[PDB]
Design a binder for this molecule. Structure first.
Ligand SMILES: [F-]
Ligand SMILES: [F-]
Ligand SMILES: [F-]
Ligand SMILES: [F-]
Ligand code: NA
Lengths: 124, 87, 127, 86
Protein backbone atom coordinates (compact mmCIF):
# COMPACT_ATOMS: atom_id res chain seq x y z
CA UNK A 1 0.00 0.00 0.00
CA UNK A 2 1.21 3.54 -0.75
CA UNK A 3 0.30 4.69 2.77
CA UNK A 4 2.70 2.08 4.18
CA UNK A 5 5.56 3.38 2.03
CA UNK A 6 4.80 6.95 3.15
CA UNK A 7 4.52 6.10 6.85
CA UNK A 8 7.79 4.15 6.79
CA UNK A 9 9.54 6.78 4.68
CA UNK A 10 8.63 9.67 6.98
CA UNK A 11 9.59 7.78 10.13
CA UNK A 12 12.89 6.47 8.78
CA UNK A 13 13.80 9.95 7.54
CA UNK A 14 13.15 11.45 10.98
CA UNK A 15 14.93 8.58 12.73
CA UNK A 16 17.99 8.81 10.47
CA UNK A 17 18.13 12.59 10.97
CA UNK A 18 18.11 12.07 14.74
CA UNK A 19 20.81 9.39 14.52
CA UNK A 20 22.99 11.60 12.32
CA UNK A 21 22.72 14.63 14.61
CA UNK A 22 23.40 12.42 17.64
CA UNK A 23 26.58 11.30 15.90
CA UNK A 24 27.71 14.85 15.12
CA UNK A 25 27.16 15.97 18.73
CA UNK A 26 28.22 12.89 20.73
CA UNK A 27 30.59 10.67 18.71
CA UNK A 28 33.99 11.08 20.33
CA UNK A 29 37.44 10.53 18.89
CA UNK A 30 37.83 7.42 21.05
CA UNK A 31 34.34 5.96 21.40
CA UNK A 32 31.17 6.34 19.26
CA UNK A 33 28.89 7.81 21.92
CA UNK A 34 26.50 9.04 19.22
CA UNK A 35 25.98 5.61 17.67
CA UNK A 36 25.65 3.94 21.08
CA UNK A 37 23.15 6.56 22.25
CA UNK A 38 21.05 6.07 19.10
CA UNK A 39 20.95 2.30 19.62
CA UNK A 40 20.30 2.52 23.37
CA UNK A 41 17.50 5.07 22.99
CA UNK A 42 16.03 3.14 20.07
CA UNK A 43 16.27 -0.09 22.04
CA UNK A 44 14.44 1.53 24.95
CA UNK A 45 11.79 3.13 22.73
CA UNK A 46 10.95 -0.13 20.95
CA UNK A 47 10.32 -1.72 24.34
CA UNK A 48 7.94 1.16 25.04
CA UNK A 49 6.25 0.80 21.64
CA UNK A 50 5.84 -2.98 21.94
CA UNK A 51 4.09 -2.58 25.29
CA UNK A 52 2.02 0.34 23.98
CA UNK A 53 0.84 -1.68 20.97
CA UNK A 54 -0.27 -4.59 23.16
CA UNK A 55 -2.22 -2.13 25.33
CA UNK A 56 -3.64 -0.36 22.24
CA UNK A 57 -4.86 -3.00 19.76
CA UNK A 58 -7.01 -0.34 18.05
CA UNK A 59 -3.85 1.29 16.67
CA UNK A 60 -3.79 0.54 12.91
CA UNK A 61 -0.78 -0.76 11.00
CA UNK A 62 0.47 2.62 9.74
CA UNK A 63 1.17 3.76 13.31
CA UNK A 64 3.12 0.53 13.81
CA UNK A 65 5.13 0.99 10.61
CA UNK A 66 5.83 4.71 11.09
CA UNK A 67 6.97 4.41 14.71
CA UNK A 68 8.86 1.09 14.80
CA UNK A 69 9.65 -0.01 11.25
CA UNK A 70 10.26 3.60 10.22
CA UNK A 71 11.45 5.86 13.02
CA UNK A 72 13.10 3.31 15.31
CA UNK A 73 14.31 1.33 12.30
CA UNK A 74 16.01 4.50 11.07
CA UNK A 75 17.21 5.67 14.47
CA UNK A 76 19.14 2.49 15.29
CA UNK A 77 21.82 0.95 13.10
CA UNK A 78 23.69 -2.34 12.88
CA UNK A 79 25.98 -1.58 9.93
CA UNK A 80 27.46 1.53 11.56
CA UNK A 81 28.05 -0.45 14.76
CA UNK A 82 29.63 -3.26 12.73
CA UNK A 83 32.03 -0.96 10.87
CA UNK A 84 32.97 0.85 14.08
CA UNK A 85 33.71 -2.50 15.73
CA UNK A 86 35.76 -3.83 12.81
CA UNK A 87 37.77 -0.60 12.83
CA UNK A 88 38.55 -1.26 16.50
CA UNK A 89 39.58 -4.84 15.72
CA UNK A 90 42.04 -3.89 12.98
CA UNK A 91 43.56 -1.32 15.35
CA UNK A 92 44.31 -4.05 17.89
CA UNK A 93 42.16 -2.67 20.73
CA UNK A 94 40.35 -5.97 21.26
CA UNK A 95 39.23 -5.15 24.81
CA UNK A 96 37.78 -1.89 23.49
CA UNK A 97 35.89 -3.67 20.70
CA UNK A 98 34.56 -6.27 23.15
CA UNK A 99 33.33 -3.48 25.44
CA UNK A 100 31.60 -1.71 22.54
CA UNK A 101 29.92 -4.90 21.32
CA UNK A 102 28.95 -5.76 24.89
CA UNK A 103 27.56 -2.31 25.67
CA UNK A 104 25.67 -2.20 22.37
CA UNK A 105 24.16 -5.70 22.46
CA UNK A 106 23.64 -6.29 26.19
CA UNK A 107 22.83 -2.61 26.69
CA UNK A 108 20.11 -2.50 24.03
CA UNK A 109 18.57 -5.72 25.37
CA UNK A 110 18.40 -4.12 28.82
CA UNK A 111 16.87 -0.89 27.51
CA UNK A 112 14.19 -2.90 25.69
CA UNK A 113 13.35 -4.70 28.93
CA UNK A 114 13.29 -1.32 30.66
CA UNK A 115 11.03 -0.01 27.90
CA UNK A 116 8.63 -2.89 28.51
CA UNK A 117 8.70 -2.36 32.28
CA UNK A 118 8.10 1.40 32.26
CA UNK A 119 4.81 0.97 30.39
CA UNK A 120 3.70 -1.95 32.59
CA UNK A 121 4.23 0.24 35.67
CA UNK A 122 2.28 3.28 34.44
CA UNK A 123 -0.74 1.18 33.41
CA UNK A 124 -1.35 -0.63 36.71
CA UNK B 1 -12.62 -1.84 24.13
CA UNK B 2 -10.45 -4.51 22.51
CA UNK B 3 -8.17 -6.19 25.04
CA UNK B 4 -6.54 -9.39 23.79
CA UNK B 5 -5.84 -10.52 20.24
CA UNK B 6 -7.38 -12.96 19.36
CA UNK B 7 -10.55 -11.69 21.05
CA UNK B 8 -12.14 -15.11 21.70
CA UNK B 9 -10.57 -18.52 22.34
CA UNK B 10 -12.53 -21.74 22.83
CA UNK B 11 -12.12 -25.50 22.74
CA UNK B 12 -14.76 -26.53 20.20
CA UNK B 13 -14.16 -30.29 20.52
CA UNK B 14 -12.11 -32.61 22.68
CA UNK B 15 -10.63 -36.11 22.92
CA UNK B 16 -9.13 -37.79 26.02
CA UNK B 17 -5.68 -37.05 24.54
CA UNK B 18 -6.25 -34.15 22.12
CA UNK B 19 -8.09 -30.86 21.64
CA UNK B 20 -9.41 -28.73 18.79
CA UNK B 21 -9.15 -25.00 19.52
CA UNK B 22 -10.50 -22.09 17.51
CA UNK B 23 -10.22 -18.31 17.77
CA UNK B 24 -11.74 -15.27 16.11
CA UNK B 25 -9.68 -13.82 13.27
CA UNK B 26 -8.63 -10.22 13.91
CA UNK B 27 -9.14 -7.48 11.34
CA UNK B 28 -5.45 -6.57 11.33
CA UNK B 29 -2.66 -8.43 9.55
CA UNK B 30 -1.31 -11.28 11.68
CA UNK B 31 2.02 -12.65 10.48
CA UNK B 32 1.68 -15.82 12.57
CA UNK B 33 -0.04 -17.18 15.66
CA UNK B 34 2.05 -18.76 18.42
CA UNK B 35 0.20 -21.32 20.54
CA UNK B 36 1.47 -22.57 23.90
CA UNK B 37 -0.07 -25.35 25.98
CA UNK B 38 0.99 -27.07 29.18
CA UNK B 39 -0.09 -28.33 32.57
CA UNK B 40 -1.76 -25.65 34.69
CA UNK B 41 5.45 -25.73 28.16
CA UNK B 42 4.94 -26.90 24.56
CA UNK B 43 4.64 -24.38 21.73
CA UNK B 44 4.01 -24.40 17.99
CA UNK B 45 2.98 -21.97 15.27
CA UNK B 46 0.24 -21.69 12.65
CA UNK B 47 0.14 -19.09 9.84
CA UNK B 48 -1.76 -15.86 10.34
CA UNK B 49 -4.59 -16.99 8.05
CA UNK B 50 -5.49 -19.88 10.37
CA UNK B 51 -8.29 -19.68 12.93
CA UNK B 52 -8.16 -23.26 14.29
CA UNK B 53 -5.47 -25.59 15.58
CA UNK B 54 -5.06 -29.17 16.76
CA UNK B 55 -3.42 -29.86 20.13
CA UNK B 56 -2.64 -33.54 20.66
CA UNK B 57 -0.47 -35.70 22.89
CA UNK B 58 -2.31 -34.70 26.07
CA UNK B 59 -3.08 -36.84 29.11
CA UNK B 60 -6.69 -37.57 30.08
CA UNK B 61 -8.10 -35.97 33.21
CA UNK B 62 -5.39 -33.28 33.15
CA UNK B 63 -6.15 -29.55 33.15
CA UNK B 64 -4.24 -27.56 30.53
CA UNK B 65 -3.78 -23.84 29.86
CA UNK B 66 -4.00 -22.86 26.18
CA UNK B 67 -2.47 -19.51 25.22
CA UNK B 68 -2.59 -17.97 21.73
CA UNK B 69 -0.27 -15.12 20.71
CA UNK B 70 -1.04 -12.93 17.69
CA UNK B 71 2.17 -11.60 16.11
CA UNK B 72 1.64 -8.49 13.99
CA UNK B 73 5.36 -8.57 13.14
CA UNK B 74 8.55 -10.39 14.10
CA UNK B 75 9.33 -8.07 17.02
CA UNK B 76 6.05 -7.99 18.95
CA UNK B 77 2.63 -9.45 19.64
CA UNK B 78 -0.64 -8.15 21.02
CA UNK B 79 -1.93 -9.14 24.45
CA UNK B 80 -2.42 -12.93 24.44
CA UNK B 81 -5.60 -14.79 25.32
CA UNK B 82 -5.67 -17.86 27.57
CA UNK B 83 -8.22 -20.52 28.48
CA UNK B 84 -8.25 -23.59 30.72
CA UNK B 85 -9.57 -27.01 29.72
CA UNK B 86 -9.44 -30.47 31.31
CA UNK B 87 -9.50 -33.43 28.93
CA UNK C 1 29.35 21.99 4.51
CA UNK C 2 28.49 18.93 6.61
CA UNK C 3 25.48 20.43 8.45
CA UNK C 4 23.73 21.46 5.24
CA UNK C 5 20.16 21.06 3.93
CA UNK C 6 21.32 19.02 0.93
CA UNK C 7 22.81 16.42 3.28
CA UNK C 8 19.52 16.04 5.16
CA UNK C 9 17.75 15.32 1.86
CA UNK C 10 20.47 12.85 0.83
CA UNK C 11 20.15 11.02 4.14
CA UNK C 12 16.35 11.05 4.09
CA UNK C 13 16.17 9.67 0.55
CA UNK C 14 18.73 6.99 1.39
CA UNK C 15 17.10 6.07 4.70
CA UNK C 16 13.70 5.84 3.01
CA UNK C 17 14.98 3.38 0.39
CA UNK C 18 16.87 1.39 3.02
CA UNK C 19 13.83 1.14 5.29
CA UNK C 20 11.65 0.11 2.34
CA UNK C 21 14.09 -2.69 1.52
CA UNK C 22 14.24 -3.94 5.11
CA UNK C 23 10.43 -3.83 5.29
CA UNK C 24 10.08 -5.89 2.10
CA UNK C 25 12.79 -8.34 3.19
CA UNK C 26 10.91 -8.88 6.45
CA UNK C 27 7.60 -9.50 4.70
CA UNK C 28 9.24 -12.08 2.41
CA UNK C 29 11.83 -13.72 4.68
CA UNK C 30 10.85 -13.33 8.35
CA UNK C 31 9.68 -16.79 9.35
CA UNK C 32 7.48 -18.03 12.16
CA UNK C 33 10.45 -19.39 14.12
CA UNK C 34 13.42 -17.32 12.96
CA UNK C 35 13.55 -13.65 11.81
CA UNK C 36 15.43 -14.38 8.59
CA UNK C 37 14.35 -11.04 7.10
CA UNK C 38 15.82 -8.92 9.88
CA UNK C 39 18.98 -11.05 9.85
CA UNK C 40 19.26 -10.75 6.06
CA UNK C 41 18.94 -6.96 6.30
CA UNK C 42 21.66 -6.77 8.96
CA UNK C 43 23.97 -9.22 7.17
CA UNK C 44 23.59 -7.50 3.79
CA UNK C 45 23.99 -4.08 5.40
CA UNK C 46 27.08 -5.28 7.24
CA UNK C 47 28.64 -6.46 3.99
CA UNK C 48 27.69 -3.30 2.09
CA UNK C 49 29.22 -0.96 4.66
CA UNK C 50 32.47 -2.90 4.35
CA UNK C 51 32.17 -2.31 0.61
CA UNK C 52 31.39 1.37 1.13
CA UNK C 53 34.18 1.99 3.67
CA UNK C 54 36.69 0.48 1.25
CA UNK C 55 35.30 2.43 -1.72
CA UNK C 56 35.34 5.74 0.20
CA UNK C 57 38.99 5.21 1.14
CA UNK C 58 39.85 4.67 -2.54
CA UNK C 59 37.79 7.69 -3.67
CA UNK C 60 38.65 10.66 -1.42
CA UNK C 61 37.40 13.04 -4.14
CA UNK C 62 33.80 11.88 -3.65
CA UNK C 63 31.64 14.63 -2.10
CA UNK C 64 30.20 14.03 1.35
CA UNK C 65 26.62 13.51 0.15
CA UNK C 66 27.56 10.17 -1.43
CA UNK C 67 28.61 8.49 1.82
CA UNK C 68 25.78 10.20 3.71
CA UNK C 69 23.13 8.91 1.30
CA UNK C 70 24.66 5.42 1.01
CA UNK C 71 25.99 4.68 4.51
CA UNK C 72 24.30 7.10 6.91
CA UNK C 73 21.10 7.00 4.86
CA UNK C 74 20.59 3.77 2.94
CA UNK C 75 22.60 1.38 5.11
CA UNK C 76 21.37 3.18 8.22
CA UNK C 77 17.79 2.51 7.14
CA UNK C 78 18.47 -1.02 5.92
CA UNK C 79 20.01 -2.37 9.12
CA UNK C 80 18.34 -2.19 12.52
CA UNK C 81 19.37 -2.67 16.14
CA UNK C 82 16.01 -1.97 17.80
CA UNK C 83 14.12 -4.60 15.79
CA UNK C 84 16.92 -7.06 16.55
CA UNK C 85 16.65 -6.13 20.24
CA UNK C 86 12.87 -6.61 20.42
CA UNK C 87 13.04 -9.94 18.58
CA UNK C 88 15.78 -11.19 20.92
CA UNK C 89 13.91 -10.00 24.02
CA UNK C 90 10.79 -11.81 22.79
CA UNK C 91 12.87 -14.99 22.53
CA UNK C 92 14.04 -14.55 26.13
CA UNK C 93 10.53 -14.22 27.58
CA UNK C 94 9.54 -17.37 25.66
CA UNK C 95 12.32 -19.30 27.41
CA UNK C 96 14.29 -20.28 24.29
CA UNK C 97 17.59 -18.99 25.67
CA UNK C 98 19.65 -21.10 23.26
CA UNK C 99 17.73 -19.64 20.31
CA UNK C 100 18.15 -16.07 21.58
CA UNK C 101 21.90 -16.52 22.08
CA UNK C 102 22.17 -18.06 18.61
CA UNK C 103 20.25 -15.15 17.08
CA UNK C 104 22.42 -12.59 18.87
CA UNK C 105 25.55 -14.54 17.93
CA UNK C 106 24.53 -14.90 14.29
CA UNK C 107 23.66 -11.19 14.14
CA UNK C 108 26.82 -9.97 15.90
CA UNK C 109 29.48 -12.37 14.60
CA UNK C 110 27.73 -12.56 11.23
CA UNK C 111 27.64 -8.80 10.69
CA UNK C 112 31.30 -8.36 11.66
CA UNK C 113 32.34 -11.17 9.31
CA UNK C 114 30.34 -9.71 6.42
CA UNK C 115 31.92 -6.31 7.11
CA UNK C 116 35.36 -7.91 6.90
CA UNK C 117 34.30 -9.67 3.70
CA UNK C 118 33.07 -6.35 2.30
CA UNK C 119 36.39 -4.65 3.03
CA UNK C 120 38.37 -7.55 1.54
CA UNK C 121 36.18 -7.75 -1.58
CA UNK C 122 36.85 -4.17 -2.70
CA UNK C 123 40.51 -4.17 -1.63
CA UNK C 124 40.99 -7.35 -3.68
CA UNK C 125 39.40 -5.77 -6.77
CA UNK C 126 41.71 -2.74 -6.43
CA UNK C 127 45.00 -4.65 -6.81
CA UNK D 1 45.04 9.32 -2.61
CA UNK D 2 45.61 9.59 1.15
CA UNK D 3 44.03 12.10 3.53
CA UNK D 4 45.87 14.19 4.61
CA UNK D 5 47.65 14.49 1.25
CA UNK D 6 50.78 16.15 2.66
CA UNK D 7 52.52 15.69 6.01
CA UNK D 8 55.57 17.70 7.06
CA UNK D 9 57.44 18.59 10.25
CA UNK D 10 57.49 22.34 10.82
CA UNK D 11 59.55 22.33 14.04
CA UNK D 12 61.62 19.77 15.92
CA UNK D 13 62.99 19.20 19.42
CA UNK D 14 65.51 16.57 20.63
CA UNK D 15 62.55 14.61 22.07
CA UNK D 16 59.45 16.10 20.40
CA UNK D 17 58.14 17.08 16.97
CA UNK D 18 55.40 19.26 15.51
CA UNK D 19 53.93 17.69 12.38
CA UNK D 20 51.66 19.62 10.03
CA UNK D 21 49.12 18.90 7.30
CA UNK D 22 46.41 20.66 5.29
CA UNK D 23 43.20 20.18 7.28
CA UNK D 24 40.03 20.19 5.17
CA UNK D 25 37.09 22.06 6.62
CA UNK D 26 34.14 20.14 8.08
CA UNK D 27 35.20 16.87 6.42
CA UNK D 28 37.34 15.29 9.17
CA UNK D 29 35.61 14.48 12.45
CA UNK D 30 38.89 13.66 14.20
CA UNK D 31 42.43 12.58 13.39
CA UNK D 32 44.08 9.48 14.84
CA UNK D 33 47.86 9.75 15.23
CA UNK D 34 50.06 6.67 15.67
CA UNK D 35 53.82 6.73 16.20
CA UNK D 36 56.42 4.15 17.18
CA UNK D 37 59.86 2.80 16.44
CA UNK D 38 60.33 1.33 12.97
CA UNK D 39 54.18 -1.18 20.85
CA UNK D 40 52.75 1.82 18.97
CA UNK D 41 51.34 4.80 20.85
CA UNK D 42 48.10 6.51 19.83
CA UNK D 43 46.35 9.82 20.42
CA UNK D 44 43.63 11.87 18.75
CA UNK D 45 43.16 15.52 17.82
CA UNK D 46 39.96 17.30 16.71
CA UNK D 47 39.04 17.29 13.04
CA UNK D 48 39.22 21.08 12.74
CA UNK D 49 42.82 21.20 13.98
CA UNK D 50 45.90 20.77 11.84
CA UNK D 51 49.32 20.03 13.37
CA UNK D 52 50.00 17.75 16.34
CA UNK D 53 52.76 17.60 18.94
CA UNK D 54 54.48 14.21 19.23
CA UNK D 55 56.65 14.21 22.36
CA UNK D 56 58.52 11.62 24.40
CA UNK D 57 60.68 10.45 21.50
CA UNK D 58 64.15 8.95 21.86
CA UNK D 59 67.09 10.63 20.11
CA UNK D 60 68.73 8.99 17.12
CA UNK D 61 65.84 6.54 16.64
CA UNK D 62 63.68 6.21 13.53
CA UNK D 63 59.95 6.68 14.14
CA UNK D 64 57.02 5.91 11.85
CA UNK D 65 54.29 8.55 12.19
CA UNK D 66 50.87 7.76 10.71
CA UNK D 67 47.86 10.10 10.50
CA UNK D 68 44.31 8.78 10.05
CA UNK D 69 41.57 11.17 8.92
CA UNK D 70 38.20 9.92 10.21
CA UNK D 71 35.36 11.45 8.18
CA UNK D 72 32.98 9.67 10.58
CA UNK D 73 33.02 7.09 13.37
CA UNK D 74 32.89 4.07 11.03
CA UNK D 75 35.69 4.81 8.57
CA UNK D 76 38.79 6.76 7.65
CA UNK D 77 40.53 7.61 4.40
CA UNK D 78 43.82 6.00 3.44
CA UNK D 79 46.43 7.15 5.99
CA UNK D 80 49.66 9.00 5.30
CA UNK D 81 52.95 8.03 6.94
CA UNK D 82 56.45 9.45 7.27
CA UNK D 83 59.64 8.10 8.82
CA UNK D 84 61.70 10.54 10.88
CA UNK D 85 65.08 10.45 12.64
CA UNK D 86 64.93 12.29 15.97
F1 LIG E 1 26.13 0.87 19.19
F1 LIG F 1 24.89 -4.73 10.14
F1 LIG G 1 19.47 -9.47 13.23
F1 LIG H 1 18.57 -1.21 19.79
NA1 NA I 1 18.64 1.34 11.07
Amino acid sequence: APLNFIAIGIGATLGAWLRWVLGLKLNGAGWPWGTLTANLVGGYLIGVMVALIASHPEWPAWIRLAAVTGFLGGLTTFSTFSAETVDMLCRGVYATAAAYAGASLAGSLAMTGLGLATVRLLLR
Amino acid sequence: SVSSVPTKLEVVAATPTSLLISWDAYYDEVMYYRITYGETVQEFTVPGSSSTATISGLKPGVDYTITVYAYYDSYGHWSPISINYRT
